[PDB]
């Protein structure tokens, strides 16, 4: 009950409860700025960024499979083929995907995702007419105007550049500008913001690196200092300390011209000294560092929601089991993020893309029965296991017990059963020339 | 209020002196004067600097000929704005500046005390090298000199200071460099 | 919320958020210069370079397989054979591939990739007429003019040598020069810049070695100092220290001529001294170094997105499982880079190459139905597993369950099913002379 | 402004002296003079050097015959530019130079004090080797000499300095070299 | 961004970017001479 009630000798717990909103907005502007800095200059986070992108994006990206209706006999493949083909076409390098032209669809997904980790979300906008049509361009996060605020007499609040309505529903966004004419109300349809929801009452998303942002800065400064101290310690070699008697009148003039060079190259060089000698003992962190660093590091990893071994390649002291467990926990997290990014971008884009493409006749099919081709499923790609023999035996046993259907296994990899069947037909034609199997 | 006490720390005699302070007298600007009082710490009579300035930025200046006989040693800088109707003065500044002995004139100036002590130690040691004696006692007079280990210690401490002032003090380094 | 808000005692997080762009451009010019220096003089990065190139390039390079249409019966092999043959022909050593002539296609891929790691991307340009035609020449990164800036009244900004349009679309590039006539606007079609996208809003790519660039410099200086200190410590042997009494009037004259040589060769040489002796104890980092170096090293590896064992061959304290895991993580990263480099260079080149080659009749086929032969797929090559028995058993089990198609397995290696079938037909002819299998 | 105070540190007497300073007087070039004041630290009257130069680069020179009687010892270098209309002088330089005793003339010059002290210690020790006595007390006079351990310490410290000045001071090395 | 920008206390990263070419040629003449020496007199490289 009275555990965290105040800040007597061990607290700091504010004084009164406050809305995460305002705190959230200030914190996020400051943090987008901050993460920008950390990712670029420190370390470990550059690693998070890389990790996130790769794990959540795709060698094959995220593909689209659409089922016309009930997949027994009421779904048909013709519509599916046409739609898939069309989407993938423009996804491949072409003038159509972006008002740039060094990019493509894969690129846009990967990038929107990187942006998402580092800045806690980002937005894309669609243009029609200039082009086909519906080209998607990403806009940098900093463009948004944090300052616009204040309600209209007939209208809802415009805080943090979001135009609320009389229903307090989202209708417009208020980016700064292209920069020059600033301020452009943009209809929501054009701008979609992905948000990775955490606490529900937010109009924005924090950089996911916030928890470890403080710890990492300190850590990089530390790594930079220790190496330097070690170098100095190796360099000064011996110190020839003296008792308190002479060294008198070391002449000033000779000092400016040169630091004397003395040859000790010869192997045996027993040396005789006038007074005394001492050997520098380096106190540069020697072996203390490996344990100390790891412990602070474990904390950061827990904060970023990733296994330590993946985040930093210490890869030490791990049995097979430890590795398997770590992968499993991360796998859950990635899956969650994967669903969310495409919960938003893909669904909006596919739906929006279809009418224009149908109108342009880019895709051949009739417009009026939109619903029949409306359904669209996005497929993520899973990560492979360390021990294939076991998995294979288990899978055979499962297929035997009608417990796993054939389709699910393919799904985990992310390939899909139709793909598998087409490929099997190709294998059968290859059999006609040579042989099949025993 | 705002204040700009920055006379150059090393102020040389017989030379024109200027800081052109940025904002010390911005408070009470309309009816209060500018002063930058300079006072010799050990003796002397406070001398003062007025304006002679461009209106936008005050520039303070002192003529070289006037500086002439100013005392060699340590001096203090205090800035005061004063108005008679107000019957008040206001002090906004503090500092310390040293006056180098006039370099363009004079019969003699030695080095700072560190040199004198050092030179003398060399002289006294020279004498006691020969004619060695810890008690020159004749009839009713006995001198009894300071122990030789003691004299040596003084030499070292002082020598270091002379090095520090010159700036050649950093501890020496020999690079093996094969 | 208020975790990274400012720089009270543990910060440095800028003061306000800033556009990664300008920072990015200055940083990149400086860094291309810097990486040039590190790769050449330090270490570990030379290793990154080697690693990147090998893993991402190819013993077989990257090959091309093109499918005319639906691969059931609507794709045919004749067109495929012709195109593949033609491409590979000029790829082999010939006058045609480059305005050089010590090189070839494999060379260009490898090189463009090395350039890419070290400089965060590089460009190639195509020439026609002088030659065939469409020869590709790589141009050094430094050629680009960072200074050209300032918009035209009727035109968009030319900053960092990129000519934006009224649509703010890419149309021209502004390299310095050949050097002598400087400044050449070059049409985008001629110059293609590969970019490895990270944060989306960039006109350029940073050297991937930036995160570890600082740590490595310091580390190499350290390695150079420690060895030297150890040598000195071994060399000075004993110091014959003396009490504060004599050594008086060591004559100046004898000193200049020679350093005395004293013979201690005889086995037993008990020695008697006038005053005292001491033995130098080397404080040169002794065993402290192995743990200390590794920890700083792990950080660098995480930054460069590679497993530590591959980057630096410490290869110590690893069980079979640890190695397997490390390979898996790197494999994902390489795959991502592989898709990107050829997402851009291959696609542009293949498409561009085809018309001229068709016109020159270098390849025999009709020009008008370009689309039928337009599709082109590039195949990467995968890396082999440590335990083949397990993999083989799993693969057999999978072929059994119609889960894996035959084609996919070949793909992971990178060989391909058509190749496999042709080779099988050759094996069958070899059977006619002797025997096949039991 | 810019300044080039670089007289050669070792300035020998009776010899022509030149630094040809690069930019010390570039400030106030049109109406202010060149000086390079040289003043003996302990006594003396400041002597000065003018121009006698090529216009593009000032070259400062002093005739050898004039140097003649200049004091042996330590000297200071200060550079001043002065204009009468301005009634100001400006000092831009600092330094220290030593005057070696005239090498082409004179009845006698010994070594620097380090040699003298060392020579004497050898002499005093010689006397006390024989006729050993810590109290030559006769009638009413008692001498009481400095302890022998003490004298020895002085010898060592001084010997090292003589070595340092000569430059033969590096600690000795014997190479076993089998 | 500003990680390797200059040589304040922990650098040496040149001052401006330079063509690997000229540096490469001088470096290589000197190095052919150098490798000739190392391979013959040291160790490990004889092994390489």
Author numbering:
A (entry chain L), C (entry chain A): 32 to 162, 213 to 260, 269 to 527
B (entry chain W), D (entry chain X): 1 to 178
E (entry chain B): 32 to 79
Please give sentences taken from the publication describing this entry.
We recently characterized a novel roseophage, vB_DshS-R4C (R4C), that could infect the Dinoroseobacter shibae DFL12T, a ubiquitous group of Gram-negative α-proteobacteria of the Roseobacter clade. Here, we report the atomic capsid and in-situ structures of the tail machine of the marine siphophage, vB_DshS-R4C (R4C), which infects Roseobacter. The R4C virion, comprising 12 distinct structural protein components, has a unique five-fold vertex of the icosahedral capsid that allows genome delivery. In this study, we use cryo-electron microscopy (cryo-EM) and structure prediction to determine the atomic structure of the phage R4C capsid and the in-situ structure of the tail machinery to characterize the distinguished long rigid tail.
The C12 reconstruction of the portal-adaptor complex, with an overall resolution of 4.7 Å, characterizes an adaptor architecture that decorates an accessory Ig-like domain at its periphery. The R4C portal protein, forming a canonical cone-shaped dodecamer with a height of 10 nm, shows considerable structural similarity with portal proteins of other phages, despite poor sequence conservation. The portal protein, characterized from top to bottom, comprises separate crown (residues 476–551), wing, stem, and clip domains (324–376)51. A typical tunnel loop connecting α8 forms the narrowest channel with a diameter of ~30 Å; an analogous structural feature (e.g., phages SPP1 and T4) confines the DNA and prevents its reflux from the capsid, with the specific conformational rearrangement in the tunnel loop regulating genome release. The clip domain, straddling the thick capsid wall, is partially exposed outside the R4C head and interacts with the adaptor proteins. The portal complex is capped by a dodecameric adaptor, which is located outside the capsid shell and interacts with both the portal and the capsid MCPs. Following the nomenclature established for the RcGTA adaptor, the R4C adaptor protein can be divided as: attachment domain (1–106), tube domain, adaptor loop (131–148) and C-terminal hook (167–178). The N-terminus of the adaptor protein is an immunoglobulin (Ig)-like domain (attachment domain), and this domain is connected to the tube domain by a long, flexible loop. The tube domain consists of two α-helices, with the α2 sandwiched between loops from adjacent portal proteins. The tube domain extends the C-terminal hook to the portal clip domain, forming an interaction network comprising five hybrid β-sheets.
